[PDB]
Design a protein around this motif. Structure first.
Motif: not given
Ligand SMILES: [O-]
Ligand SMILES: CC1(C)S[C@H]([C@H](NC(=O)[C@H](N)c2ccccc2)C(=O)O)N[C@H]1C(=O)O
Ligand SMILES: [Zn+2]
Ligand SMILES: [Zn+2]
Length: 241
Positions: A95-96, A91, A93, A160, A179
């Motif tokens: 972190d990804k 997705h 964000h 999420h 996540c």
């Molecule tokens: O995330």
């Protein structure tokens, strides 16, 4: 040794490589872990996957940054030494998808939910090169995911985030919740700022039903867990409605 404030700690069987940690989960699957250092708070670990499929490597999720993602590619070169064919990112964000430019510079083909690509600029992310679309039952439309080898891509519904996707690895015990899924002992669902609190529980259950055989549930911010992670995530999500 990196000791995260959020995320699993290092355990036996983990390999430190530069600023990252790698753990072999199956003969042809490894978990990559990267760390975002927040001043006055500490490190936040995030996990993705590396899959050897015959003579090529497939990546699930970037690291937090371009440099960390380049370190993933260097680890692949040193430990596996096969071409990286593609990446699927789960997705929009940091972190990804924070390391998309590093994948693109290396000539790696990238795929994300169309909605992730639409949200990407709004979320400070570089969009993937290709958009995945999904049937009403959540399964990826086959023509949008060509030559994915053992990767089975499933959109479980909003949870999420509205765009969150999940990935099973055929021929293994592994399904990756990103996540969306928290571990069986978590007391929080993490950042719910972009979450769909009404539909989260059903989305977590849909993930479980899509990959009913998987016994090793891999997720962004905990060590791999049993299917109790799915049950527990869904039960925490039930309390949001
Ligand atoms: O995330
Ligand atoms: C670990 C998180 C609580 S943060 C991460 C994500 N957030 C980011 O990538 C942010 N860019 C970020 C900002 C400050 C510190 C850490 C992350 C999110 O909002 O889903 N995923 C969350 C989660 O998976 O619950
Ligand atoms: Zn997120
Ligand atoms: Zn996360």
């Amino acid at each position: 040794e990196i000791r995260p404030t959020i995320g699993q700690q290092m355990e036996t069987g983990d390999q430190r490589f530069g600023d990252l940690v790698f753990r072999q989960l199956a003969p042809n699957v490894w978990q990559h872990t990267s760390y975002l250092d927040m001043p006055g708070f500490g490190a936040v670990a995030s996990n993705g996957l590396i899959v050897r499929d015959g003579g090529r490597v497939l990546v699930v999720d970037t690291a937090w940054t371009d440099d960390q993602t380049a370190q993933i590619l260097n680890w692949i070169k040193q430990e596996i030494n096969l071409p990286v064919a593609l990446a699927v990112v789960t997705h929009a964000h940091q972190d990804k998808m924070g390391g998309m430019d590093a994948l693109h510079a290396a000539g790696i083909a990238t795929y994300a939910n169309a909605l992730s690509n639409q949200l990407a600029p709004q979320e400070g992310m570089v969009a993937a090169q290709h958009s995945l679309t999904f049937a009403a039952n959540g399964w990826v439309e086959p023509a949008t995911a060509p030559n994915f080898g053992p990767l089975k891509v499933f959109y479980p519904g909003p949870g999420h985030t509205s765009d969150n996707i999940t990935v099973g690895i055929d021929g293994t015990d592994i399904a990756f919740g990103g996540c969306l899924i928290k571990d069986s002992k978590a007391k929080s669902l993490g950042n719910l700022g972009d979450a769909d609190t009404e539909h989260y529980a059903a989305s977590a259950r849909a993930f479980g039903a899509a990959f009913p055989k998987a016994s090793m549930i891999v997720m962004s911010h905990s060590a791999p867990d049993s299917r109790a992670a799915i049950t527990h995530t869904a039960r925490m999500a039930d309390k949001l409605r």
